[PDB]
């Protein structure tokens, strides 16, 4: 246990950040994904019509 | 005399109900691309208030500020409307009009340009 800490003092801080990164990404990934779908909805919905005389 | 004549000729007319459903407005785009035509027409409008509303006055003031333009219009660069002076100055279009089209409880408020 001491030898792990000696090799990687950061072990605990890193793991705390990991949690906060996972949390923020849980928020931000569906959020931005939703933003994407909104803008693109104009295009996703569109219907095409060919009408030569 | 008009009223008499009305009574005389029209009184057989029936008065005995088609009333108008609200009309739902929708933000939308319709594009007929036809490259073979020589100029493009664009009409754009927001939902307006409809015949009765007192906003139509203030809206028509605003529409008049922005105005209408046609490439025969003498005013050109010196015109009062920024849209028109800029459109004349930079040959942005042949023409445009603001409109406020009024219906029962809805309308088209905007502008059409050819360019
Ligand atoms: C080994 C290494 C790997 C190599 C690569 C590494 C390189 C580095 C990375 C570089 C990345 C490059 C990729 C670039 C892509 C950029 C975006 C792009 O172009 O378009 C996106 C591209 C397609 O975009 P699109 O508009 O769907 O296009 C559809 C097509 O037209 C096709 O239309 P369709 O109708 O046929 O599509 C069917 C639809 C439907 O089929 C499905 O599979 C349905 C399943 C959906 C899953 C859940 C949906 C989430 C929100 C929707 C709400 C309803 O499937 C899709 O849309 C496919 C996209 C992926 C599905 C979504 C993600 C699934 C994850 C499941 C998690 C479940 C829990 C959710 C709760 C969230 C809260 C934490 O999708 C992806 O690549 C996915 C990115 C978006 C995912 C975000 C969703 C949130 C997930 C949970 C987050 C948790 C965080 C951490 C934990 C939290 C703890 C608190
Ligand atoms: C010009 C400005 C540049 C800014 C870039 C904008 C980033 C946009 C995307 C963000 C992704 C969302 C996930 C981030 C999780 C952040 C959570 C968090 O607070 O973590 C940070 C470390 O995280 C972190 O350090 C994680 C950050 C991950 C960002 C890496 C991408 C950018 C590369 C930077 C390289 C130069 C510190 O947490 P603690 O030490 O507990 O501090 C407590 C609060 N002050």
From Swiss-Prot, chain A:
Superkingdom, taxonomy of origin = Eukaryota
Residue ranges annotated as Mitochondrial matrix topological domain: 45-53
Q: What subcellular compartments does it reside in? A: Mitochondrion inner membrane
Q: Where are the transmembrane segments?
A: 11-44
This chain's function reads: Component of the ubiquinol-cytochrome c oxidoreductase, a multisubunit transmembrane complex that is part of the mitochondrial electron transport chain which drives oxidative phosphorylation.
Q: How does it assemble?
A: Component of the ubiquinol-cytochrome c oxidoreductase (cytochrome b-c1 complex, complex III, CIII), a multisubunit enzyme composed of 11 subunits. The complex is composed of 3 respiratory subunits cytochrome b, cytochrome c1 and Rieske protein UQCRFS1, 2 core protein subunits UQCRC1/QCR1 and UQCRC2/QCR2, and 6 low-molecular weight protein subunits UQCRH/QCR6, UQCRB/QCR7, UQCRQ/QCR8, UQCR10/QCR9, UQCR11/QCR10 and subunit 9, the cleavage product of Rieske protein UQCRFS1.
Membership in a protein family: Belongs to the cytochrome c family.
What is this protein's record name? Cytochrome c1, heme protein, mitochondrial
Source organism (scientific name): Bos taurus
Gene that this sequence comes from: CYC1
- In the complete protein, the residues contained here run 272 to 324 of 325
From Swiss-Prot, chain B:
Q: Which first-to-last residue range defines the signal peptide? A: none
The UniProt family comment states:
Belongs to the peptidase M16 family. UQCRC1/QCR1 subfamily.
Q: What is this protein called?
A: Cytochrome b-c1 complex subunit 1, mitochondrial
Annotated S-S bridges:
none
Quaternary structure (record): Component of the ubiquinol-cytochrome c oxidoreductase (cytochrome b-c1 complex, complex III, CIII), a multisubunit enzyme composed of 11 subunits. The complex is composed of 3 respiratory subunits cytochrome b, cytochrome c1 and Rieske protein UQCRFS1, 2 core protein subunits UQCRC1/QCR1 and UQCRC2/QCR2, and 6 low-molecular weight protein subunits UQCRH/QCR6, UQCRB/QCR7, UQCRQ/QCR8, UQCR10/QCR9, UQCR11/QCR10 and subunit 9, the cleavage product of Rieske protein UQCRFS1.
Purpose of the protein: Component of the ubiquinol-cytochrome c oxidoreductase, a multisubunit transmembrane complex that is part of the mitochondrial electron transport chain which drives oxidative phosphorylation.
Modified sites of kind N6-acetyllysine: 8
Q: Where in the cell is it found?
A: Mitochondrion inner membrane
Show which stretch of the intact protein is covered: 241 to 360 of 480
């Amino acid at each position: 246990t001491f030898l792990r800490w000696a090799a990687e003092p950061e072990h605990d801080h890193r793991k705390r950040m990991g949690l906060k990164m996972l949390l923020m990404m849980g928020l931000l990934l569906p959020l931005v994904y939703a933003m994407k779908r909104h803008k693109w909805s104009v295009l996703k919905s569109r219907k095409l019509a060919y009408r030569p005389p | 005399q008009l009223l008499d004549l009305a009574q005389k000729h029209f009184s057989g007319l029936s008065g005995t109900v088609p009333t108008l459903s609200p009309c739902r407005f929708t933000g939308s785009q319709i594009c007929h691309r036809e490259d073979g035509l020589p100029l493009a027409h664009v009409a754009i409008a927001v939902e307006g208030p409809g015949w009765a509303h007192p906003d139509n006055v203030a809206l028509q003031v605003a529409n008049a500020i922005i105005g209408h333009y046609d490439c025969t219009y003498g005013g050109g660069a010196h015109l009062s409307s920024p849209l028109a002076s800029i459109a004349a100055t930079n040959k942005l279009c042949q023409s445009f009009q603001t409109f406020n089209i009024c219906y029962a409880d809805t309308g088209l408020l905007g502008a059409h340009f050819v360019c």
